[PDB]
């Protein structure tokens, strides 16, 4: 935990931001958590790509290769945002190249290839289950899993659920030592995440995160944080709005992060 005014400031942030806000922070220094609306369901949008690349990483631990297995990219595979796979159409990408592209560039084509390889949404969910996450559910594919319609449980998780699941994956032992590091390597290389959580933390703090955008102004970010001379933090910030066509609010997440790391 922290103080009585974090919740007041969070609710202030929420009300003034014109939406709905979910937060879960874990401080590995003392296993204190800050939790705002952290038991309500939020639409993961591209944050779900962490569960995909990680579900594969686990498989690599019982398939001495796998991560180099090449995967065909086809013209019919293409969806709105594919910054990487567009360069290997009629070619191949290994599962590592795909995970890499999905995590660091939010490559929607990549994401679908990850879902495909692990047997579809339900088997990504079953992966979260075996990690002790009984909340995460992935139900659809790129691009539809980002609809983020209010009331709709599909492709949601809770901030508590995902902060803990993320802690296990990136810091704990949900993965092998070398898979864990690899997941950390990919997150730390994310290209897209600067205006979000990271904008709310001391400039000198080191961030590996995955943002997520979607319908209804849904702006999300999930992050592992290594301050110099501290123990690391898990911070999960979900935010969504009422207008179907609202613009993203990356700064609401940064503001969230400044609030829940004040005094650290």
Residue numbers in the entry: 25 to 288
Quote the study's own text:
CTX-M-15, which belongs to hydrolases (EC 3.5.2.6), cleaves lactam carbon–nitrogen amide bonds rapidly, deactivating β-lactam antibiotics. To understand the mechanism of CTX-M-15 activity, we have determined the crystal structures of CTX-M-15 in complex with two specific classes of beta-lactam compounds, desfuroylceftiofur (DFC) and ampicillin, and an inhibitor, clavulanic acid. The binding pocket of CTX-M-15 for those β-lactams was established by the residues from both the α- and α/β-domains, surrounded by the catalytic residues Ser70, Lys73, Ser130, and Glu166.
In addition, the crystal structure of the apo-form CTX-M-15 indicated that there were several water molecules in the binding pocket. Thus, association of compounds would gain entropic contribution by replacing these molecules.
